[PDB]
Amino acid sequence: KQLSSKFGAISSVLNDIFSRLDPPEAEVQIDRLITGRLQSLQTYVTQQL
């Protein structure tokens, strides 16, 4: 279910962001998406530990 979270963006698919939005701020959008998913993965890893 964490893959379905927009995390404040306009879409949940990074390919859609890359092919739909201007790259100079699509880089920032992709950075926000990957850091949100990284934080979710860190939380899951702490729960697993």
């Binding site: 092919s19 739909r20 939005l21 201007d22 790259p23 699509a26």
Partner: protein, 49 residues
């Protein structure tokens, strides 16, 4: 969109919710064109929020 993005016979072209560079790449269902004239003082008002 070459006459709108690649070529500029119009004074000002600006896209907010979509990428102006990849206008030809996207595919949509339909477009609702609103044509109207504003004096130069109030043309800034055509923007969300």
């Amino acid at each position: 969109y070459s006459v709108l993005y690649n070529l500029a016979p119009f004074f000002t072209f600006k896209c907010y919710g979509v990428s102006p560079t990849k206008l030809n790449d996207l595919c949509f269902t339909n477009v609702y064109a609103d044509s109207f004239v504003i004096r130069g003082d109030e043309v800034r008002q055509i923007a969300p929020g």
